């Protein structure tokens, strides 16, 4: 509903098709936060 | 357009085709008027530098005292009277072809100045402390037997092996009797178009006289004879009488 760019499109398509199911992903704001923290000289990353 | 009909000329043409992928220096030898400059320009045209400069230079018209300044250049304060920097001919023809015409008239003191530049391609200007590197292909032409000069001692041995990587010898017109009539017809048509005459061809006796003559000026002499015949002609055909210059 807010910032899953692929999830919004998939949810809209499923709703129009009559299938009420979602495939959540990563919010874009968390990616923005990771980039901002990396720009401060700190290595933050996802594991596995 | 040029005429190549003799088997030797066709073999030379095939060699020119084969050496089109190389950048080696070429040395052209022959008599006077055989077509050395024609071959040099054809070699330039058929090479990879076809759109690049073709600097033709007569090395016998350069004064002895300013020989270095003409080929290498000089900086601003090299000598008295030098006001501005100026390039030479080895830097004017960078990326192209340099054609040394009549190289056999160069004195040994002048020959000694062309040793390192031909092979290395690097030099210093007159008054310059920076080394200039150029990419020039060397064609050289002469009408004297360079090997005989080297054996006698009139030509430096260190320059012959630098220039003579590939050697082409053009046979005299006396040995190219399959190539005489087409040249005569070509020159006849050219001069008839230029001077607006009415001649069209040679008689059989005229052809025999042309083919039997031992040309010493080669193609240049043939061209002069044809031009004179066209100028002084009055009839439709150039018979044996008009060719009275030949003995």
């Amino acid at each position: 509903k807010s910032d899953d760019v692929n999830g919004r499109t998939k949810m809209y398509k499923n709703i129009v098709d009559g299938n009420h199911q979602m495939e959540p992903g990563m919010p874009e704001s968390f990616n923005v936060l990771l980039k901002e923290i990396r720009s401060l000289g700190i290595n933050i990353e996802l594991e596995d | 357009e040029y005429v190549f009909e003799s088997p030797k000329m066709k073999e030379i043409l095939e060699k020119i085709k084969k050496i089109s992928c190389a950048e080696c220096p070429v040395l052209i030898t022959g008599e006077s008027g055989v077509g050395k400059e024609v071959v040099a320009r054809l070699i330039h045209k058929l090479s990879d530098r076809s759109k690049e400069p073709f600097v033709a230079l007569n090395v016998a018209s350069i004064p002895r005292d300013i020989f270095e300044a003409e080929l290498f250049g000089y900086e601003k304060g090299a000598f008295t009277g030098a006001v501005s920097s100026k390039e030479g001919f080895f830097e004017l023809a960078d990326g192209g072809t340099l054609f040394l015409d009549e190289i056999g008239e160069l004195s040994l003191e002048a020959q000694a100045k062309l040793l390192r530049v031909i092979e290395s391609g690097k030099f210093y200007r007159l008054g310059g402390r920076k080394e200039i590197e150029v990419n020039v292909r060397i064609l050289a032409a002469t009408n004297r037997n360079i090997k005989e000069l080297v054996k006698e001692g009139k030509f430096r041995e260190d320059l012959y092996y630098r220039l003579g990587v590939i050697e082409i010898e053009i046979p005299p017109l006396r040995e190219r009797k399959e190539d005489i009539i087409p040249l005569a017809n070509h020159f006849l048509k050219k001069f008839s178009r230029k001077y607006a005459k009415e001649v069209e061809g040679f008689t059989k006796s005229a052809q025999e006289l042309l083919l039997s003559y031992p040309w010493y000026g080669n193609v240049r002499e043939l061209k002069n004879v044809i031009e004179r015949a066209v100028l002084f002609s009055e009839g439709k055909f150039i018979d044996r009488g008009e060719l009275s210059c030949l003995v």
Partner: protein, 202 residues
Amino acid sequence: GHIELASPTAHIWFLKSLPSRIGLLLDMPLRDIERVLYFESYVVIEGGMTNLERQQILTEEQYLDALEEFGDEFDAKMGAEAIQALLKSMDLEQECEQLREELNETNSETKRKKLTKRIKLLEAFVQSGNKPEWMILTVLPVLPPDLRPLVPLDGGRFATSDLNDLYRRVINRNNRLKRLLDLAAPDIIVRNEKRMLQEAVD
């Protein structure tokens, strides 16, 4: 992207966040670290055979007389290069063992707390893969452009953002410092340029 800094610059988070990691790691008061960083005083790197310590704070006249007396027997520097040199020459194992021996032998309360804190910091640094000299910046990361967009307004004016202005200031200072360093400019001006670059990065 990244920016190549002409001279090393300290990271303000590891200097101005109490307790100071750089100061607690080097066992130096924060005032002396700040004085050395902003080109106000000297610090000895290698004491040599003279009577100079390895972290002694000097001043301009003191450094001048030390040079005119001793000469090339002691090494002294100012700025972030000196701090990076101090951080790069430390051995963590020897410091840890000496601090643990001193903690075991001496008994106190405030000194006990200080030694415990420094021991824990040093062992945390050893256990992780970090190295102390990484707390001095040499390459500066640059944020992607779409996260710092320009503001388009009516009339064809793009204006500017705060982040873009700070990046422009840093780049201008870095370029001027590069040009001054490669021209062998006098030190009295390059020191001021280095101080301004440090301030811009901060």
